Amino acid sequence: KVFGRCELAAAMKRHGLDNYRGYSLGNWVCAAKFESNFNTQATNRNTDGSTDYGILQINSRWWCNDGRTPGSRNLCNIPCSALLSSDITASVNCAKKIVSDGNGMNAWVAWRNRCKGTDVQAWIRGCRL
Ligand SMILES: [Cl-]
Ligand SMILES: [Cl-]
Ligand SMILES: [Cl-]
Ligand SMILES: [Cl-]
Ligand SMILES: [Cl-]
Ligand SMILES: [Cl-]
Ligand SMILES: [Cl-]
Ligand code: NA
Numbered sequence: 001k002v003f004g005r006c007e008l009a010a011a012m013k014r015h016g017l018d019n020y021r022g023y024s025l026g027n028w029v030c031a032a033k034f035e036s037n038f039n040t041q042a043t044n045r046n047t048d049g050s051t052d053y054g055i056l057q058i059n060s061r062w063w064c065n066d067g068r069t070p071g072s073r074n075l076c077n078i079p080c081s082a083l084l085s086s087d088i089t090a091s092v093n094c095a096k097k098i099v100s101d102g103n104g105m106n107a108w109v110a111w112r113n114r115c116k117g118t119d120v121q122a123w124i125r126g127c128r129l
Contacts, residue, residue: 001039001040001041002038002039002040003040003055004038005029005033005038005123005124005127006126006127006128006129008029008055009029009123009127009129010127012025012092013129015088015089015092016096017092017095020099021099021100022104023099023105024120025123025124025129026121026122027120028095029120029123030111030114030123031056031105031108031110031111032056035055035056035057036054036055039055040054040085040086040088042055043084044057046059046061050069050072051069054083054088054091055088056083056091056095056108058076058083058094060072060080061073063075063097063098064080064083065078066080075097076093078094
């Protein structure tokens with residue numbers, strides 16, 4: 001599914017991401033725009049053989065099982081295919097574990113390079129939340 005900006009902001013707010021570990025909702029919508037263009041079916045292969053999955057591009061090296069990342073962990077205890085669903089619950093729940101891992105939203109390279117220290121409130125401007 002390809003989300004609208006305000007549609008995704010509302011879904012993330014309903015799932016408890018607004019100010020989760022101090023990151024306001026605009027941060028999460030900004031990360032999802034630059035990671036996936038708001039497309040839950042996005043996948044991207046890494047040089048190390050791992051794959052990133054879904055609207056927040058969660059990596060199989062640590063977070064989900066795709067059965068083809070040798071020596072990897074499954075810290076969210078899910079199949080990576082669960083991260084491609086139109087239902088963002090599995091992606092949000094895994095995102096909560098990642099952002100709690102010590103580095104905050106710096107885990108998401110596109111957040112650090114494209115959202116961090118910008119006016120992220122612009123990503124929820126005009127939305128009925
Ligand atoms: Cl947009
Ligand atoms: Cl915000
Ligand atoms: Cl594997
Ligand atoms: Cl594991
Ligand atoms: Cl699995
Ligand atoms: Cl959803
Ligand atoms: Cl932090
Ligand atoms: Na894995």
